[PDB]
Amino acid sequence: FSAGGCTFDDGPGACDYHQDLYDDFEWVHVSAQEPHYLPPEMPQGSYMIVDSSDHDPGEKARLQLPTMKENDTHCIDFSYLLYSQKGLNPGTLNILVRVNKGPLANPIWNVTGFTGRDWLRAELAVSTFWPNEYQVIFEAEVSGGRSGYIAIDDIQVLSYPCDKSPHFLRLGDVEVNAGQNATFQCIATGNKLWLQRRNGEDIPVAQTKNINHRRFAASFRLQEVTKTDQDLYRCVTQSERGSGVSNFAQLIVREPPRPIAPPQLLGVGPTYLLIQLNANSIIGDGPIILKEVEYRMTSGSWTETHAVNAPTYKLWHLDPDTEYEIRVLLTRPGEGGTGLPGPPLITRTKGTK
Amino acid sequence: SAGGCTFDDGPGACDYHQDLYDDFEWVHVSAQEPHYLPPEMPQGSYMIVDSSDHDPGEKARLQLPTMKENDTHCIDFSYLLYSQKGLNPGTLNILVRVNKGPLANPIWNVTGFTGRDWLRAELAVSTFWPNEYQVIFEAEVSGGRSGYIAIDDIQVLSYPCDKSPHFLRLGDVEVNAGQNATFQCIATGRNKLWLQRRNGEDIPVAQTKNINHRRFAASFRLQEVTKTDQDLYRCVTQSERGSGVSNFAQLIVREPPRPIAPPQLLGVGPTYLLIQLNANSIIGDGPIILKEVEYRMTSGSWTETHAVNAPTYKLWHLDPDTEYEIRVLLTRPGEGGTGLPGPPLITRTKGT
Ligand SMILES: *[C@@H]1O[C@H](CO)[C@@H](O[C@@H]2O[C@H](CO)[C@@H](O[C@@H]3O[C@H](CO)[C@@H](O)[C@H](O[C@H]4O[C@H](CO)[C@@H](O)[C@H](O)[C@@H]4O)[C@@H]3O)[C@H](O)[C@H]2NC(C)=O)[C@H](O)[C@H]1NC(C)=O
Ligand SMILES: *[C@@H]1O[C@H](CO)[C@@H](O[C@@H]2O[C@H](CO)[C@@H](O[C@@H]3O[C@H](CO)[C@@H](O)[C@H](O)[C@@H]3O)[C@H](O)[C@H]2NC(C)=O)[C@H](O)[C@H]1NC(C)=O
Ligand SMILES: *[C@@H]1O[C@H](CO[C@@H]2O[C@@H](C)[C@@H](O)[C@@H](O)[C@@H]2O)[C@@H](O[C@@H]2O[C@H](CO)[C@@H](O)[C@H](O)[C@H]2NC(C)=O)[C@H](O)[C@H]1NC(C)=O
Ligand SMILES: *[C@@H]1O[C@H](CO)[C@@H](O[C@@H]2O[C@H](CO)[C@@H](O)[C@H](O)[C@H]2NC(C)=O)[C@H](O)[C@H]1NC(C)=O
Ligand SMILES: *[C@@H]1O[C@H](CO)[C@@H](O)[C@H](O)[C@H]1NC(C)=O
Ligand SMILES: *[C@@H]1O[C@H](CO)[C@@H](O)[C@H](O)[C@H]1NC(C)=O
Ligand code: NA
Ligand code: NA
C-alpha cells in the first residue's frame, strides 16, 4: 500500500508525522517499552494521546501527516477514542485536510464527547490527486478541567476496499458573470452533507436527488455572485463511520466589460460623422464577443444600435448642424455578459454654409 | 459635383460609356442634325432607344461614371417612353452597381407609354467613400417593336434632394446557422419597399412602423438562415418620383463548432478514466468560448457535464467494469452557438 500511515510503535517521527512548536501543546507518544502510567482501562501498545488535565479550555494540539500526492483512488483509516475515568467530555477530535499547503479550512470529520475505552474506527476518502497534494491534520481541541484523554492509533493508507465512507466524483469548476446565480453539483457513491469554502462560510444544501441505487446528487446554490465570492469550494459529507471529501473546484466571477475612454471624431461633414471608438482599453473581462455602437440625436426620441468590428465607424444621411451622442457597448460570454454603455462622445455635424 | 450630363456634346463628353456585351447601343440625338424623329418628340439633345430596330428583350446599357462621394447627394434625370400610337415601348431600368461588383436587380423602373413630355425622377444612394457605385440606365425593348425610350438632363445634386427617401446606415448582421436573422432600415420621408439581395432573390417586407415625424422604419425577417444566404443586402424604396437605396449590409452565417474526432483513452483503472479530448480540430467556426466534457454511464440515468480548458481530463471514483460514454461539446458566441456533441468515446473501467 501507499506510504503515509503509522502504527506509532517507533513513534510519530518514524512515520514522517510532525508537530509545530507554535501550537498550544504537543500530542504525546504512548509506547510499549515505557512505564504504563495511564489508567489501566486505556489500551495497551504504542499510540498518540492528548490529556485535557494539563491544559485550559480550547487549547489545540495538532499532529500533521506527510504530504499525499497520489494518482489512484485511496482512503485513510484511523482509530480514535475519547476517555474519562468519570465519563467527562475530554474535548473534540477534529480532522482537517489541507490542500496545496494552503488554508486549512474547517474540519471535515469530528467527534465530540466520551466514547469509551475501546478503539473506534473511521475512514477518510479525499478526492485530491496529483499534481495536487494534501495533508491530513489530527486536531485535538481540549475541553479543559482534567476531563480525560483524546487518543489516536493505527493510521493506514489503503487502496481497497475503501467502502466505509462515501466517495465524491470530480467536482467541476464554475464560471459566471457577476450578479448571476452559480450552482455547484456534487455526485457521491454510497448523513450530514455540505459545501465547504476554502476560506469562508460553509454553504448549506439547496437540493438533493437519489439518482441511482449506488449514487446520489446534491446541489448548492450561490445567488447573485460577487467578485469577492471567487474562491475554491469542495463538497464534504460526514458519518460516524467516516467522511468523504471532494476536490477544491474553483468559482470564477467575471466582470462585464465597458470602455475606459469615450469615442473621438476623426472627420465630419454636413451629413456624416467619422468616429473612432477607442474601445480597445476597457474595465472588466474579455473576451469581447460583440462590440456595438449606439448613436442618438440629442433631441432624439430613439437610438440606433449597430454591431461594429472595426476601430472606426461612419454614420451618414445625418442632419446638418445637429448634435449627436455616441456610445459603445461591449459584450462577453454568458448571461449578464453585456456590459454598461461606455462614456459618450457628444459632437455635431457641420452646417449648410 | 461632376458626373451629370446634359448631352449637348454627347455621352462621351460626360464620361458616359456603354457595355460591349450589350445587345445594342443607346443613340445620341442632337439639335445639330435635322429632326428626323416624330415631331411630337421633344427637341434638343438627349439619348434615345428605338424599339423598332430591335427584337423583344434586347437590352441597351448606358453607364455613368463611378461616384465615390462623402455627404448626402442625389441624381436627377428626365425620361419618357413614347409611341405615335400609344404603344408600350418597353422598360427603362436603373441599376446601381456597388464596388464594381454584381449589378443586382433594378432599383427604379418604368414600363409603358408615358407621353411626349419629359418626366423627372430622383435617386438617393447611401453608398459612400471608401465604397463606390455606378448608375446604369438600361432599356429593355418591348417586342411590340414600336416607339422610343429616352433620357435627358442628368444632374448630380447635394441639395435639396427631397423627392426620394434617404436610408440611414444599414448595419451588418451575424447569426449562427439555423437562427432567424433580421434587417432593419430607417428612412426619411413621407410606397413600394423591399430588401434587395445582391446575387439572389428580393425579400419582401415583414413589418413597418413609425418611429418619428420625419423618419419611418421597416423590418425584414429571414427564417432559419443557412450558409447559402450569406450575401450582401440593401434596402430599396421606389415611387413614381424616384428611389432611395441603402448601403450593402452583410449577412454572416456562422457554423456552430463540433470536434471532428472522438476522445481517446490515455489511461484506465478500476475507478478512473484519463481522457484526451482531441477537440483542437473542428468543423464549425471559432472562436471557441466554452469547451465541455460530458460523461455518462451507459445505463444513462444521469449525465455529468464539466467545463474543461485543457487537452486532457481525468474522471474518478467510477464503478469498476462499467461502460462510460464520453463526448466533447464546443460553443461559439451567440444564440445557437452551442454545437452538436462530438463523436463519443465508449469505454469501460477495469475490474480488479
Ligand atoms: C465539526 O465540523 C463542522 C464542519 O466543519 C464544524 O461546523 C462548522 O463550524 C464553523 C465554525 O468553526 C462554521 O463557520 C462559521 O459559521 C458561522 C455561522 O454559523 C459564521 O458566522 C462564521 O463566520 C466567521 O468566518 C468568516 C470567514 O469569512 C468571517 O468573515 C466572519 O466574520 C466569522 O469570523 C464561520 O463561517 C461552519 O459554518 C460550520 N459548518 C457546518 C457545516 O456546520 C463544527 O464547528 C465542528 N465542531 C467542532 C467542535 O469543531
Ligand atoms: C422592376 O424592378 C423590380 C425590382 O428589382 C423587379 O422585381 C424583381 O424581379 C426579379 C426578376 O427579374 C425577381 O427575382 C425573381 O424572383 C422570383 C421569385 O419571386 C424567382 O423565382 C426568380 O428566379 C427571380 O429570382 C425579384 O423577386 C423581383 N423583386 C420584386 C421586389 O418584385 C421587376 O422585375 C422589374 N421590372 C422590370 C419590367 O424589369
Ligand atoms: C502520478 O502521475 C504522475 C504523472 O505520470 C504519469 O502517470 C504515471 C502513473 C505513469 O503512467 C507515468 O508514465 C505518466 O507520465 C507522476 O509524475 C511523474 O513521475 C515520474 C516518476 O517519478 C517522473 O519520472 C515524471 O517526471 C513525473 N511527471 C510526469 C509528467 O510524468 C507521479 O509521480 C505519480 N505519482 C504517484 C504517487 O503515483
Ligand atoms: C471622403 O473623405 C475622405 C476622408 O477625408 C477622403 O479621403 C482622403 O481624400 C484626400 C483627397 O481629398 C486624400 O489626399 C487622402 O489620401 C484621402 N484619405 C484620407 C484617409 O484622408 C475622400 O477623398 C473623400 N471623398 C470625397 C469625394 O469627398
Ligand atoms: C437568482 O435566483 C433568484 C431566485 O428567486 C432570482 O430571483 C434571481 O433573479 C436570480 N438571479 C439571476 C442573475 O439569475
Ligand atoms: C423563425 O421564424 C419562424 C416563423 O417564420 C418560427 O416558426 C421559428 O420558430 C423561428 N426560429 C427561431 C430560431 O427563432
Ligand atoms: Na499502535
Ligand atoms: Na439635354
Author numbering:
A (entry chain A): 31 to 220, 226 to 388
B (entry chain B): 32 to 221, 226 to 387
From the paper:
Type IIB receptor protein tyrosine phosphatases are cell surface transmembrane proteins that engage in cell adhesion via their extracellular domains (ECDs) and cell signaling via their cytoplasmic phosphatase domains. The four human R2B RPTPs (PTPRK, PTPRM, PTPRT, and PTPRU) are type 1 transmembrane proteins and share a common extracellular domain (ECD) architecture of one MAM (meprin/A5/μ), one immunoglobulin (Ig)-like, and four fibronectin (FN) type-III domains, with the most membrane proximal FN domain undergoing furin cleavage in the secretory pathway. Previous studies have shown that PTPRK, PTPRM, and PTPRT form homodimers, but not heterodimers, in cell aggregation assays. The homophilic (trans) interactions of R2B RPTPs determine their subcellular localization and have been proposed to function as spacer clamps between cell membranes.
Here, we have solved the X-ray crystal structure of the membrane-distal N-terminal domains of PTPRK that form a head-to-tail dimer consistent with intermembrane adhesion. The structure comprises a MAM domain (residues 31–192) that forms an extensive intramolecular interface with the Ig domain (residues 193–290), followed by the FN1 domain (residues 291–388) that makes few interdomain contacts with the Ig domain (discussed later). Three glycosylation sites were observed in the electron density maps at asparagine residues N101 and N140 in the MAM domain and N211 in the Ig domain. Two chains of PTPRK-MIFN1 were present in the asymmetric unit of the crystal structure forming a head-to-tail dimer and burying a surface area of ∼1750 Å2. The dimer interface is formed between the MAM–Ig domain from one molecule and the FN1 domain of the opposing molecule, similar to that observed previously for PTPRM. Notably, the orientation of the W160MAM carbonyl oxygen is caused by a cis-peptide bond with the adjacent P161MAM, a conformation that is stabilized by the side chain of W160MAM stacking with the N-acetylglucosamine of the N101MAM glycan. Both W351FN1 and H352FN1 occupy a deep groove located at the MAM–Ig boundary of the opposing molecule, burying ∼90% of their solvent-accessible surface area. All but one of these key residues are completely conserved across the R2B receptor ECDs, the difference being that PTPRK W351FN1 is a glycine in PTPRM. Mutation of W351 in PTPRK to glycine significantly disrupts dimerization but does not completely abolish it. Detailed comparison of the PTPRK-MIFN1 structure with the equivalent region of PTPRM reveals a significant hinge movement (approximately 15°) of the FN1 domain relative to the MAM–Ig domains. The differing MIFN1 interdomain orientations result in low shape complementarity for the modeled PTPRK–PTPRM dimer interface (Sc = 0.206) when compared with the homodimer structures (Sc = 0.581 for PTPRK and 0.575 for PTPRM).
